[PDB]
Symmetry: D2
Subunit: 446 residues, 4 copies
Amino acid sequence: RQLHLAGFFSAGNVTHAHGAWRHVGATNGFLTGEFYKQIARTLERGKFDLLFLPDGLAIEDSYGDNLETGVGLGGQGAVALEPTSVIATMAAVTQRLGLGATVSTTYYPPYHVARVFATLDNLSDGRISWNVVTSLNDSEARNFGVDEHLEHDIRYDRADEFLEAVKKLWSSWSEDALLLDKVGGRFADPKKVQYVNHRGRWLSVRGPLQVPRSRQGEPVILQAGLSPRGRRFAGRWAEAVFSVSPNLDIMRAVYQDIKAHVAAAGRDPEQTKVFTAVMPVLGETEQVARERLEYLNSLVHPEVGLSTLSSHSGLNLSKYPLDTKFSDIVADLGDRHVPTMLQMFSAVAGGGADLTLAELGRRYGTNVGFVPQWAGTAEQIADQLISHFEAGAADGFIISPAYLPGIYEEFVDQVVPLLQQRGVFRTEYEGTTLREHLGLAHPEVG
Amino acid sequence: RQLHLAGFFSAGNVTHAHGAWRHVGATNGFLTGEFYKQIARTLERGKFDLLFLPDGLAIEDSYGDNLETGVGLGGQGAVALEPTSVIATMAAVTQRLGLGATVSTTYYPPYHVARVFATLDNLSDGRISWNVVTSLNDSEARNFGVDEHLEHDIRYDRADEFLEAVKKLWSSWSEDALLLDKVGGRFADPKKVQYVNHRGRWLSVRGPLQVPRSRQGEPVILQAGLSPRGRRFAGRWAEAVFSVSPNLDIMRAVYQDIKAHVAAAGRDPEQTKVFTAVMPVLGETEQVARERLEYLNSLVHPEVGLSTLSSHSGLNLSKYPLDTKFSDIVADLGDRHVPTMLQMFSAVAGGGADLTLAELGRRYGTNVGFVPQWAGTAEQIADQLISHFEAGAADGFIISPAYLPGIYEEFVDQVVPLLQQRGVFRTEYEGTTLREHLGLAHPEVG
Amino acid sequence: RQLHLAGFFSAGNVTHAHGAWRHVGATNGFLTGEFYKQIARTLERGKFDLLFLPDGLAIEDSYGDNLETGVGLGGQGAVALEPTSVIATMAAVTQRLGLGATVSTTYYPPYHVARVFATLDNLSDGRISWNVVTSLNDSEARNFGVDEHLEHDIRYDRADEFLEAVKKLWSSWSEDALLLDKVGGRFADPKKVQYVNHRGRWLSVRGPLQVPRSRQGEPVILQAGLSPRGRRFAGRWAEAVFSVSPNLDIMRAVYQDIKAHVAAAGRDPEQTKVFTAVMPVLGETEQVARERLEYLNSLVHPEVGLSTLSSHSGLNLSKYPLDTKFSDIVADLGDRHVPTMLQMFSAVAGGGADLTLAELGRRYGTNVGFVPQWAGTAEQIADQLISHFEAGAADGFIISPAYLPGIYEEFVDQVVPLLQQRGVFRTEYEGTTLREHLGLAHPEVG
Amino acid sequence: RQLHLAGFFSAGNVTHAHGAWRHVGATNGFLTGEFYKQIARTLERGKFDLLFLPDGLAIEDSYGDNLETGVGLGGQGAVALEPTSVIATMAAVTQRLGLGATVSTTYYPPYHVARVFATLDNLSDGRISWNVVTSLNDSEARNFGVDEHLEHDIRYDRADEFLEAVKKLWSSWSEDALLLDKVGGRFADPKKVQYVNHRGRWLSVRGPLQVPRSRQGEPVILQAGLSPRGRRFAGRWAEAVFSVSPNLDIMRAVYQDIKAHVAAAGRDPEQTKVFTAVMPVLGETEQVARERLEYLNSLVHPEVGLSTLSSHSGLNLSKYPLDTKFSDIVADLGDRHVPTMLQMFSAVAGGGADLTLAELGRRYGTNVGFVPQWAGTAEQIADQLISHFEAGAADGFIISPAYLPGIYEEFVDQVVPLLQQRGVFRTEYEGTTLREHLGLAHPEVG
């Protein structure tokens, strides 16, 4: 039984560690092709299952109602390259590594999503995946000139239909439809390419898709949303789920809940892979590791962290002074309208203690609050990865990068070989497609 | 005085030569990364200014109201990969060649177009261009769930505002905005990144763009629609224009007309480069060349040709029997109710003869009616390119490929060196960006 | 039953076709890395077993006893890059294609040959082969300051010992010798890395070799000398043999003879692959191919053909006026003193005619006398390849290039797919090493 | 005044840090193409002037006169790939980085050296250099079957003629000799390609070379031998000199002496670039840096260190028990019979302490005695590089790698940008050739 590894980072300035761009070792090459080529080549060298890019469609604005924090201090989405271009770039220099990107159902039509991913799936010869997102953020909508509004759970119901339409399009070409019979003059079999004529409540798309199926049949569906409604959506469609849990117990709880939602939807739980995020910080000795972690966290500016904390909680904390104790906010708002995640992070952050807004933002900025920072030698990190895996924490891990590209080099050079030697991680790619890497079946047409 | 060269081909089964996919030398590798990498490398080897991909968002459908012709015989857009993904793939393995893709202002919003192109521009280090189209075809609209109409010329007025919006976005980061002051903790200067707040008759987009400017400042704007309104739009926005004229006389006419449009828009005519299409067929001897062109043209199926002829003329000719003569159609519609392009093609193609639909379609399918086929030795081809260039046919040539990838190998290996030896074409890239290749100024932030 | 395919060309100005550099399509990129990278990627795209480079260590000097013909007209060895650097370059951009280079046992010691090939083997991850040569040419010898003159058959006796020593060197590391046990501090097992202590009549080399075994164990041995002694040598050592035969009768005879020498050396005939050389000229129609062959052959300058003929015949034909008739040369030396290959070539090239020297050199220069030129459509070339294979002409074919790089593009694009459709040639690489492509067993240590 | 940077490492298991292969971060990928491709791409990304590989032609044998120490523990030359193949591999994936290799005049003839470097120079488009070596090591000699024994200083006399011979060969083709006049049938001008006819006391080679000159005229000559004779040899021939000095006083003395030997030979001192070796060890903080250096030095096995100390000193220390004190060795042998470098090393490495052989070996193995280890922050290393440069220690630095590939990543990502920000190191390559990077002149033919 073998675990899976995935890479994950913003095509831009910041992922989870909000002081990353400040690290002495950060090249900040996020505007260059070579930076992405290098990361992709490195993860492939480490035989990673996949490298996956999140996406945000606006510079983070909520905190301050202006760009002062986001642009000035390097906040979420300050720089965010269009993800599909980036992964096409990475596909061009790799041949096994799986590649995925977030694309929103909210701002793009089903035909676009269908065709862009079928295209990437063919260009990469079956290595592509799509992270389905359904969010509606104000700054994003204003970038797309959207004015309408749909309730959280309704957006998911709409996404159900979106997925149906996309899957229909992906099946519009039989796997034996393309003929290229030069002599006969038969390009394809028109009986094997069908219109889709999808016309549901939310969406209308005629088809057929202009792109045949890759050798993996269809792109792998990835899902990250862990809301009650999201978990349901995941159980139905998701082939791999990305989760963030601060410790083993929650990891295990999240794991079993996801697997259950999948069984509930009528699907094989073992056909949905569950990854959990960790942020390793290596050192030749444990002491060096801890020292390096301390340095990394010290780079976090309290306000960038607060800015991200605002976005994630929905609460605009720029309204309050930074020295505002969390108490005064509880009382100013009432423990009934204060998002649970906030109260959760708060309790765990200072350990029941009472923190200033500045101090909570600073800590949230280190690891987006809940991503475990593991500091140790490569042997320890490997031991922890293995011990968590055997304990049912997850089927694989998302390695959240402390700084780029350096941390991935260190992880691939130092940790992957220990995992391989222990027999818990591939020494070589067995198949050629992302589905083969994750152990997923080849979906059939229809 | 040096000419420019560009390649142009569909990321799919067919471009101008409708028999291409049946050619004994066609690899039909259009679903694979290596096909596109190979071509990009080949044109970079030949020091080409750019290669750009048209786009079509549906399998052509009119002819027959079905897929039998498009899918069965390999008509326009039977296979059509999403072009930005493809050029990203190409940028990844090249370093000087300019790259361009068509994205429609009809189906995509300004923020999206701005971001994807700024992203590509950065990834390629300033070699990207955007071919602007504004068409609204029925079958494409059905793929996108669009039911709204907008008259041809109005789509251009809408396009004007789109271009304004996009250009503002590309100017939302000053070129000295990004700081990366790690010590100080200043990521970027918030006074040098600004909201766009575009709110027009047609469009709304807040900004700022989440991507700063590449080293060429802004992607190059390409234009290919040469209707009266297209000519005005080119005059106002185009930095490169792509045209099809069957001979020198008409090339000269179009060339002067485009340059006149640019000056009339208050711009410098020398800052808009005009490319004219030609479809070369080489042979070691002129006799071999002729035989090869004859072989190529013999591969066209009359009905694929006919279907493209219907699309381009606006008339669905499938309604008529294949053996119907043109007169029998010209009379059934009246000398008034017959598209100008159709009369012009009918006159040139038949040289006076009254042809069947079948025969017009077959002839149309060889060269989309008006792309000149130049069969000759390399010396003859180079002589003619130089001759037309000196005669003011164009600033450059778009080389339309009879079949791929082979025709580009031949042209780069055989013709380019002769242009280079005659001194009319670069022996090496002088600069690194597409703007420098084209001799275009680096725009200032607005 | 599948046939094998190999490329073969000099890293320089000329291989078999002596007008190749003058061909309109010749890039003459033979001084550039890109030329070799392109060809290597192309043969790999066509799934060739192997690309192999000859070598010659002096500009061909005999004819006219100067550099006038060699340098002025582009004779054999005029430009000749060191082959191992070339294949290393090609190894860097390919993943499956086999690669081979000629290195002479005459001028280089076993230790050097063993180390360079083991290095290439490791760098290419098991794709390398060595073409063993034992020849002694006067101009080459003067470049290396060699005075000794070993007799033809004796050079092979030395080479027997040479091969023994190289093979010993390649066995100096067991395949499990290298440990890399970082924690225990154990680099390799010194019991499993052994001195060779070779001390024979011809050679001394202590060892051990400083390079462990690749995943294919040892580089593949290639042999191309078909003299009686050379055939005994091939029987003992060769794993692939390369031969030139003008027609099927001769091909079959050479095939049987080689396999018999192998059987007589106590080895398995099926473990020595025989490749025969063919020079295809493609056309869309057979008429096009024939005109292209005519054009190619018209490029040969009489005196460069004469030069190569002089070297191969051992007879300096520069003494004679170019208009001398062959019969007058026979008269000059007496029938008994005319080299047999020269008499035979004259009869065959002339079909009984009494040709001038010029005309004899011209025809010889088209194909070095005996490489069969096959002009036809792709279907015809494929038919003939299959037909000869079925008739027992060879286990595979060396495709001698009329001109580069273009001919290999045509061959791979046009002929290879037809061989694949017919089931006679791999559609994909089954293994990763050169031995796996050729169906050769991985040799064991000792 | 900008400084120059060079990488330097053995294509194998150990360079200067004898514990390097055991480092948690070492990939030990030295048998694979990707390892070398990664490092070349990294140094090119860092805009290095050059990467240079030393060579050894035998597994270090002296210590214990067996393979026990070298093979068992990973001593000098345990694994050593042939270096010309390795740099070809590297040249294939870079386009600016200079590349050099050690080839011995002792074991190879002028023609071979001249042709291999002219080939690499052409393949890399003028980026190559040759480190000239004249040493005679018993074990190397046994691998090449050499019995002859020339005195240290005479090998340098013979090397003088060798170099003469090589340069004549590199001048055998004028830079305008090659014509490629296809129409006219003129390949090259036979008047511009000349025989060499070198006949000297030591060597004979006729020529001409079969390789024209690259963009940079001739390969750059590198020299690293600093014996009195070697310094003279460097004065006459070297264009770049590589030197190991433990401190600023010595660096400056070496620098001035070399500059003076060049001027004494009639050459411009500014046309010979002096590089001095340093082994940086980086940390986020000086404290981390110091822990990392301590970790790295802790990996050295006393016997491997001793083995190299024995080879370099010329005194076989394996005869003595490891616990033997140095004073006891001097007493046993006589002060006249213990090499000076060895007594000097004992004195400096122990600071006056009387150390055992084991502890001497352990210390020597960290840095081959005299390569300065610099542990600090990126800012500190930049500072030291800059101040040593300004104090006249050298024209540039060789960065000796603590472990591979990781240390070059750290150095390029962390240190290079600070050097660039301070204006003492190029932000981009100005020219394309190695001669341009080093500020050297293009040599004139003849």
